[PDB]
Amino acid sequence: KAFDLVVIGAGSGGLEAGWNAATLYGKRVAVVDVQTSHGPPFYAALGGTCVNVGCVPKKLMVTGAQYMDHLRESAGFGWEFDGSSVKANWKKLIAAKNEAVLDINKSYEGMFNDTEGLDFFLGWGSLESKNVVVVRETADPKSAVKERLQADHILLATGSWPQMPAIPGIEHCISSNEAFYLPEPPRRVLTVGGGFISVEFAGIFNAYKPPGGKVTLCYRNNLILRGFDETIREEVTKQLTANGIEIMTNENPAKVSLNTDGSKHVTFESGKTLDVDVVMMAIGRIPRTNDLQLGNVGVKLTPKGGVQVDEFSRTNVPNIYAIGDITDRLMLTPVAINEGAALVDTVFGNKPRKTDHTRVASAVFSIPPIGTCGLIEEVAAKEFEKVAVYMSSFTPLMHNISGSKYKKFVAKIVTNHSDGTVLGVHLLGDGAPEIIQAVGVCLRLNAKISDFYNTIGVHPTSAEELCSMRTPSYYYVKGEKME
Amino acid sequence: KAFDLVVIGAGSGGLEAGWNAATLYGKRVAVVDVQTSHGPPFYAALGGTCVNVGCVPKKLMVTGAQYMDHLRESAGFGWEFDGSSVKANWKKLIAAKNEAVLDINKSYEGMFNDTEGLDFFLGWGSLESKNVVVVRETADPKSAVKERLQADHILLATGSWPQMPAIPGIEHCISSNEAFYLPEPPRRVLTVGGGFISVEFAGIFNAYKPPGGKVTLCYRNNLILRGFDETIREEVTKQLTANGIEIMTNENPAKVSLNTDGSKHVTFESGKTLDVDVVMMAIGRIPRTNDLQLGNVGVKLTPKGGVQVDEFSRTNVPNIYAIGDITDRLMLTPVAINEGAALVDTVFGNKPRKTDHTRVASAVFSIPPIGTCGLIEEVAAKEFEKVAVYMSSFTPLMHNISGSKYKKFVAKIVTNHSDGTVLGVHLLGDGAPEIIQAVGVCLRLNAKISDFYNTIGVHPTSAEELCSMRTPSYYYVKGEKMEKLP
Numbered sequence A: 001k002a003f004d005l006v007v008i009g010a011g012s013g014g015l016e017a018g019w020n021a022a023t024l025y026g027k028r029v030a031v032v033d034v035q036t037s038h039g040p041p042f043y044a045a046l047g048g049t050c051v052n053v054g055c056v057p058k059k060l061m062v063t064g065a066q067y068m069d070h071l072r073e074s075a076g077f078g079w080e081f082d083g084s085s086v087k088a089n090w091k092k093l094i095a096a097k098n099e100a101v102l103d104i105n106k107s108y109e110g111m112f113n114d115t116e117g118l119d120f121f122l123g124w125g126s127l128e129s130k131n132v133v134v135v136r137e138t139a140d141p142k143s144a145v146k147e148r149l150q151a152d153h154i155l156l157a158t159g160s161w162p163q164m165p166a167i168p169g170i171e172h173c174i175s176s177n178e179a180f181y182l183p184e185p186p187r188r189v190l191t192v193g194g195g196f197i198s199v200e201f202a203g204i205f206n207a208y209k210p211p212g213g214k215v216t217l218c219y220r221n222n223l224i225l226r227g228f229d230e231t232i233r234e235e236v237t238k239q240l241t242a243n244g245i246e247i248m249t250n251e252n253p254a255k256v257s258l259n260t261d262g263s264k265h266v267t268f269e270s271g272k273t274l275d276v277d278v279v280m281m282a283i284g285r286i287p288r289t290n291d292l293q294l295g296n297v298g299v300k301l302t303p304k305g306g307v308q309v310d311e312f313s314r315t316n317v318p319n320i321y322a323i324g325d326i327t328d329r330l331m332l333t334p335v336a337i338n339e340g341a342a343l344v345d346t347v348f349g350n351k352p353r354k355t356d357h358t359r360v361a362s363a364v365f366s367i368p369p370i371g372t373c374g375l376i377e378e379v380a381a382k383e384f385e386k387v388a389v390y391m392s393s394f395t396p397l398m399h400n401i402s403g404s405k406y407k408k409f410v411a412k413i414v415t416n417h418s419d420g421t422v423l424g425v426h427l428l429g430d431g432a433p434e435i436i437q438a439v440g441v442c443l444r445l446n447a448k449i450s451d452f453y454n455t456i457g458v459h460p461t462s463a464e465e466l467c468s469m470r471t472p473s474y475y476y477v478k479g480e481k482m483e
Numbered sequence B: 001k002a003f004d005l006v007v008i009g010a011g012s013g014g015l016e017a018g019w020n021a022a023t024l025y026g027k028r029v030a031v032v033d034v035q036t037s038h039g040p041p042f043y044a045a046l047g048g049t050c051v052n053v054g055c056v057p058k059k060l061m062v063t064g065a066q067y068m069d070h071l072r073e074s075a076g077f078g079w080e081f082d083g084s085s086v087k088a089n090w091k092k093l094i095a096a097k098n099e100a101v102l103d104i105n106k107s108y109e110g111m112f113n114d115t116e117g118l119d120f121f122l123g124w125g126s127l128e129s130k131n132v133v134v135v136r137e138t139a140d141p142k143s144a145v146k147e148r149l150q151a152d153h154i155l156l157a158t159g160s161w162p163q164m165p166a167i168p169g170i171e172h173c174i175s176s177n178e179a180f181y182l183p184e185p186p187r188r189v190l191t192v193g194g195g196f197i198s199v200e201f202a203g204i205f206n207a208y209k210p211p212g213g214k215v216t217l218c219y220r221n222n223l224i225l226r227g228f229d230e231t232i233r234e235e236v237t238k239q240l241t242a243n244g245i246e247i248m249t250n251e252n253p254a255k256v257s258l259n260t261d262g263s264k265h266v267t268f269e270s271g272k273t274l275d276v277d278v279v280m281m282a283i284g285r286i287p288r289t290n291d292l293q294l295g296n297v298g299v300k301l302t303p304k305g306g307v308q309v310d311e312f313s314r315t316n317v318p319n320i321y322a323i324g325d326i327t328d329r330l331m332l333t334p335v336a337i338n339e340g341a342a343l344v345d346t347v348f349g350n351k352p353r354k355t356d357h358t359r360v361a362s363a364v365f366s367i368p369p370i371g372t373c374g375l376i377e378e379v380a381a382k383e384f385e386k387v388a389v390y391m392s393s394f395t396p397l398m399h400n401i402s403g404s405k406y407k408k409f410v411a412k413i414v415t416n417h418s419d420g421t422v423l424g425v426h427l428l429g430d431g432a433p434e435i436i437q438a439v440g441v442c443l444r445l446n447a448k449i450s451d452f453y454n455t456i457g458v459h460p461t462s463a464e465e466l467c468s469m470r471t472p473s474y475y476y477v478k479g480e481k482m483e484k485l486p
């Protein structure tokens, strides 16, 4: 069969691209994915990683984890109930999450039936030649051919995959993929990694752990959440600890063995040991290029294994494009979606558009959560002669009553002090992901600190902190911090 | 006894002006208020209405109220506990709120003592003459003079006060003032009014009511929350009804009598009756101008009763200014604050600045809450030839799981369709007040709909809805609503 566009991976980017090509530019479109619904054995499926084993289910499970805090905090506002009756039923959470994800799976199924010129093929897509995608039974290129799809244009949109360290006993460890399908909540869990996935799952496991349970998070470096604002990294460390999570920094697993009872015996590089029920490896995600047989067409890969792309998502082979995590730039669903739209607008619209990977608002669904947009100060301080930092950090009033006095809201604005232009906004606290979205719009409009502090506050809110900062807390002058 | 600035009312507006003048321009400032800490008899005190009997305590109490929904909603996420053991202890909430408000009262006391040239005076401020404020012991102009303050400049910042309809048995009724100090949560309560205070208090009472309790909100017209987006007004009405609140529209108390058991027999103009333990009037607030003796120096009031001001907060009388609720415009703490900061930068900083009363973000801590900034579509449609409305209304996935399927999230953007300029943004749902703040900055930057839709979403959030809307849902053309443009 012959298509204007064949999309390998029915994920965030691949579905946006395919749908836009078909419906907006009236192209005939094929899309390939390995599974029609969520879970084992391939985890990602129709909808992509976000829908199946990413943003969507994880946000539901963090929402669930948040009730641990709400139930406790309710008491400061006069709520009374039998604390000893309280159970976190993980099986119910997983069932609710599964129905939500399956409902999305099914609606995508329906979208493919009801959308003329948009066809779904099940199985493993790879490049036979520069105008032919072969769909096969398995990831093994010797497996049976299901389809051969003639393609004017080929979009690689296979996303990323958990990185597992080659340590002895790696097979006794899981990734985020398996974490979504644990039948029981682990009593003892080690999350390995200081990134958003380790931290978000550490919060999930901490809420649902059975009595006398314990969540440990380990990270090879000194401070979790590298890439985030340093004040936020320190505070989220403190606030995780105050909710009973053990943060082991400068620690990394050397090997894993099974204890006699089938629990995992963890030996850290430091020699230290830890017995846990689950070891969840969240140390990175790598582009999924192994199965695509890109050697058949000579698409240039980076040493990392990402598809190399120009700003317009073009590979070195004309008619073959890559978007989303496979490009190993910003691994976020809205960026993949944005890349997908910009490509189809370029290729089929002659409306040439590149995704701006700068000033992308993002969140961490930690407890409490992070919202951030633009540059952290250390980065700004190398690219700008004078940087101002406006900082507000305090326990909001409601958390003095709640009893969570450790829950400092952090609001930080980083500016080019020469003209007041906002380079970065960094939030930690309840609502931070919701606050930061319209901040993304501000930074796209080249907002200055004066545009923030001349806006009238909404009171009482956490967000009004952003519009109450007149005076820098400190500066960077030629990379050097000054009071 | 001589001061650069005398401020009457140590409230949101008065303290901002007072503090700025003293600390920014080394000016010498007297601030007058009738009370140093919250509660009876005068309710407002040092800090003002917001701190003592307004935004601050209200928000704590709405936060308390929200736990009724969290406790129920937790079950969909697998939380289990003895539902029959759940009690809402109103007395605990009020004691916690009182301690929090008292600490702020004490925080302001420390501010005055620490700050050179910033002095507090206890008592009632009135105008003797153009340049003299007299502090008396009571609101009576005849009570003893505690002080005579010479003023190069006088600021009137005495705020507003609940209006109590002059109906038989109004003395059986309370205002928001008394609601903050009820010793027990009412089993049955009638909140009178369709504005934010009646709506917010209905939410609070609804969560804290003892068993067999019932919250009734009455409004004299057809649809609550006049001046908010019509879709949001209809949705809040449904979402409050879905949570057990009874909304009586086109209904208004004609009188109240005490039953022999201490309860209130309410008779509506319609002839309907209702027995409740509490009647809270929240039908309006009116500027506090009486006790200032404005008639002594001829400060002009408006046909509505508020102090007439120009864009610079100036009265007809030179050296006499008025900010905040006494001007009877937007009764919001951050506007009062902005006006005070602007006045002091104009008069003392030689940096004339006028408050922008357009594109002001605000909220209603309804459950769930409203966040809004700029024009509703009906108002835009009268000013602009072509208005586009972008609308997304849906139950978020988490509220399908929580069991609160009635919690439709509403996100509406109103534009000038001739250039895409965003004229107003209207949100209903969890987080709306937080989402809307940075939208206020967007509107100050003259953001177009394309500035929103070209910004990359934060996923998953409610807020990303605002960056997902490219196609108008409908339009006004020369004031006429229609699906499609001609």
Ligand SMILES: Cc1cc2nc3c(=O)[nH]c(=O)nc-3n(C[C@H](O)[C@H](O)[C@H](O)COP(=O)(O)OP(=O)(O)OC[C@H]3O[C@@H](n4cnc5c(N)ncnc54)[C@H](O)[C@@H]3O)c2cc1C
Pocket: A008, A009, A010, A011, A012, A013, A014, A032, A033, A034, A035, A042, A044, A045, A046, A047, A048, A049, A050, A051, A053, A054, A055, A056, A058, A123, A124, A125, A126, A157, A158, A159, A160, A176, A197, A288, A291, A292, A323, A324, A325, A326, A330, A331, A332, A333, A334, A336, B459, B460
């Ligand atoms: C635990 C976790 C949480 C996350 N949380 C967030 C978040 O909160 N917000 C956010 O913005 N991002 C989040 N992300 C990132 C987000 O999921 C990704 O950035 C996004 O899904 C990538 O989109 P994509 O189009 O690149 O690929 P994907 O959405 O991963 O889609 C790739 C698809 O290709 C399929 N596939 C792979 N190989 C083949 C093949 N050979 N043939 C056919 N099909 C194939 C896969 O089955 C999959 O469906 C999260 C990721 C994870 C793992």
Ligand SMILES: Cc1cc2nc3c(=O)[nH]c(=O)nc-3n(C[C@H](O)[C@H](O)[C@H](O)COP(=O)(O)OP(=O)(O)OC[C@H]3O[C@@H](n4cnc5c(N)ncnc54)[C@H](O)[C@@H]3O)c2cc1C
Pocket: A459, A460, B008, B009, B010, B011, B012, B013, B014, B032, B033, B034, B035, B042, B044, B045, B046, B047, B048, B049, B050, B051, B053, B054, B055, B056, B058, B123, B124, B125, B126, B157, B158, B159, B160, B176, B197, B288, B291, B292, B323, B324, B325, B326, B330, B331, B332, B333, B334, B336
């Ligand atoms: C229940 C309620 C909830 C509210 N919620 C919010 C909200 O969530 N967000 C928001 O932005 N706004 C809210 N408001 C409005 C907010 O409280 C006001 O807009 C704001 O306080 C007005 O500030 P001001 O400077 O005009 O005066 P105020 O803050 O009202 O200060 C006036 C002060 O003057 C004193 N005073 C009066 N007469 C005299 C006199 N003769 N001599 C000396 N002192 C005198 C009073 O004691 C008082 O302290 C709410 C109001 C109420 C009643």
Ligand SMILES: CN1CCN(C(=O)Nc2ccc(F)cc2)CC1
Pocket: A103, B392, B394, B395, B396, B397, B400, B465, B468
């Ligand atoms: C871009 N938005 C995303 C959210 N959204 C929506 O409707 N979500 C949804 C809720 C519940 C459910 F069951 C399925 C989807 C509106 C459009």
Ligand SMILES: [Br-]
Pocket: A221, A222, A223, A224, A226
């Ligand atoms: Br580090």
Ligand SMILES: [Mg+2]
Pocket: A111, A112, A113, A114, A115, A116, A117, A118, A119
């Ligand atoms: Mg089809």
Ligand SMILES: [Mg+2]
Pocket: B111, B112, B113, B114, B115, B116, B117, B118, B119
């Ligand atoms: Mg002093």
